[model samples]
Target: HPETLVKVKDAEDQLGARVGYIELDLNSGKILESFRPEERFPMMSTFKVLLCGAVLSRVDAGQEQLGRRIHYSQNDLVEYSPVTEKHLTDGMTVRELCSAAITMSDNTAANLLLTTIGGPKELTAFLHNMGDHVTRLDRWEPELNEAIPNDERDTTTPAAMATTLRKLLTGELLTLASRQQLIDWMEADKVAGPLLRSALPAGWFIADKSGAGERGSRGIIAALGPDGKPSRIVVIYTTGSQATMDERNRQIAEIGASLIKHW
Candidate 1:
């Protein structure tokens, strides 16, 4: 733990930014490490985890099915997504939409799923029931362009995100199959950048979700060591107007490497 703490602090100091982070030992329910873990930050794309949870909760309750189809028109299309680039005029199934939402960080897919689940209030309610009080899904991807402050946007703390992740993994918020599906999608995520994946040792797997903003990047990675056992929950939310992408990625990589060693 000392070695991990030193490395994490070094990374944070090198970046000279505001970073809220936490590591949870799932096996023992311990806070193995942390820095500003309770402070809330903009959720960015990370809220999609909860959004996916909301969708899957309905599916688990027999209110929805994975094969159900959701049609997407022009209005549903938005920028910053690979799904929109494919010109999926025929729409996508619930499973496909959920896959894209986590795997690709697809905004269009998230919007469709959010709308289908009865909007942000539904997601907020679902998360609240699962023991998260600070995280909120108050707006859609398009609304992120209204020039609002970052803190005012959808937000959550590292601690809160960890709570959500624990619930998801333990099947308290979703059915067992649904939980596995979410983790599978996270493992297949294509847009996690160099933060968590860049420093992982071979054979190790991380089920994660990441997001970027004008200030910096934020993400949560559930890392399983090479043996495929639950290792650690890494939640990092960083913000610095002066921090470049390369610096942020470097810091995140350092943190990831540090976690691998300790967890």
Candidate 2:
């Protein structure tokens, strides 16, 4: 247990980047810790977590089916689509798309799921209806760009997202079955492999989505805790550093280590 709080400003000083974070106990919705939790940061591929949840809501409402096939042309893919780019021929099921988007942070799969659930505005509308007015998705993949200097497009505060994600995964906002599917996908994440996951002590379970782009802009959102400890969710991000991917990833891992040391 980290008896001392991981201060946000100190982290910023360490990385020379703005930082935002919030850690909450899943069982009671208690904010265990935070720093600049309301500060804005790009959603990056991290938004795909909500994208998949939005689609899952449709499935729980009987408006959509995970088994349905979604066919897409080769041109549908953008850069960084490791999963969907290889499956252009036979297409992928809605469930498979969710896996690619959440587990692998696949751009093409996110776009397909975005289209399946309407569009960016529709997802924002979903956030509005869910009582989260802060998290907004404005455009499709690649174009959303994750970062736009002064623009706030495709961004959300750490607190807003942690609340929204907590509802999606733990509350009655989604059916038990639907919620479990999302958890499975998150637990299988490839994105966190080199970031948050690498920082944690071994066998400490982590279910999260990692984001990287726009220089050293990197972040991770997850429901993680010690093997037998209480459940907690962390929404953390860093932005505006000129560091390389390796350097930025180290920062993320360092933060995770700082927070999870006592766990």
Candidate 3:
């Protein structure tokens, strides 16, 4: 345990930011290692994972379907959203929105899904159902650009997110089909380079979502280890980074690589 902490500290020292890290054994629900696991960080697009879960819960209840179409109007567009850039005129299916939201970190798609699922109140309730009290989605993407304080933005702790991921992967909060679809969407994520998935070994399947903020980036990676049991769930959140983006991403990769070696 000391060794693992040392490795995490070593990575943390390289970056000019506060970092929260957690590694959980999915099968046993044990926290193998953590650092500032309870500290909250601005979730950035990592909150989209929670949004995806909420939508799927509706799907499970027969309230929604993946085939449902969502129109991408100008009102839904926001800065830094590739999905809106590509499909501003044409609408997309619910499945497509979820895919873009996770894989591309599309803010417009995230906002659309939040609206479709009845906004932050519903998402907050879903998080509470999953046993996380601290995570919150206070505002949509447009509101996020209006100079809101970091504390007022979407937020979650490493511990909270890791536990939520465990529940999703283990089918504790979703039906088997919904669980599988979520995993599949995450696996289809196309954004690569300097994130957790890039650091993992070949043959290790990772279903993950990542996000970037002005100060730093954060991500949650749930991987099926080689043995295919007790999936390794890793959550890394950072903020107030003085380092360049490349350097911060390298720090994240180093942390991920170290966890893979030990856990």
- The prediction achieving the highest lDDT against the true structure is 2
User: What shift in Å separates residue 220 of candidate 2 from its native position after superposition?
Assistant: 0.4
What is candidate 1's lDDT per residue for 19-84, written digit by digit as tens?
778888765657778888877677777778778888888999988899998776776678876875
- Per-residue lDDT tens digits for candidate 2, residues 1-263, read 34324445556777788888888889899887877788889888889989988999999898899999989998998998898988888999999999999988898999999898889999999999999999889988887765866578889999999999899989889999988898889998976777778877766777899887675678999988777332889888888887777877776777777777754
| Candidate 3 residue pairs that clash | none
List ranges where model 3 is wrong by over 4 Å: 142-152, 227-230
**Between candidates 2 and 3, the lDDT winner:** 2
Q: Name the better of 1 and 2 by lDDT.
A: 2
lDDT of each: 0.76, 0.84, 0.77
Query: Would you list the clashing residue pairs of candidate 1?
Result: none
- Count of clashes in candidate 1: 0
TM-score of 1: 0.92
Q: Order the candidates by lDDT, highest first.
A: 2, 3, 1
TM-score of 3: 0.91
Worst 10 residues of 2 by lDDT: 1-10
TM-score of model 2 relative to the true fold?
A: 0.94
Q: Against the true structure, what is each candidate's TM-score?
A: 0.92, 0.94, 0.91
Clashes of each: 0, 1, 0
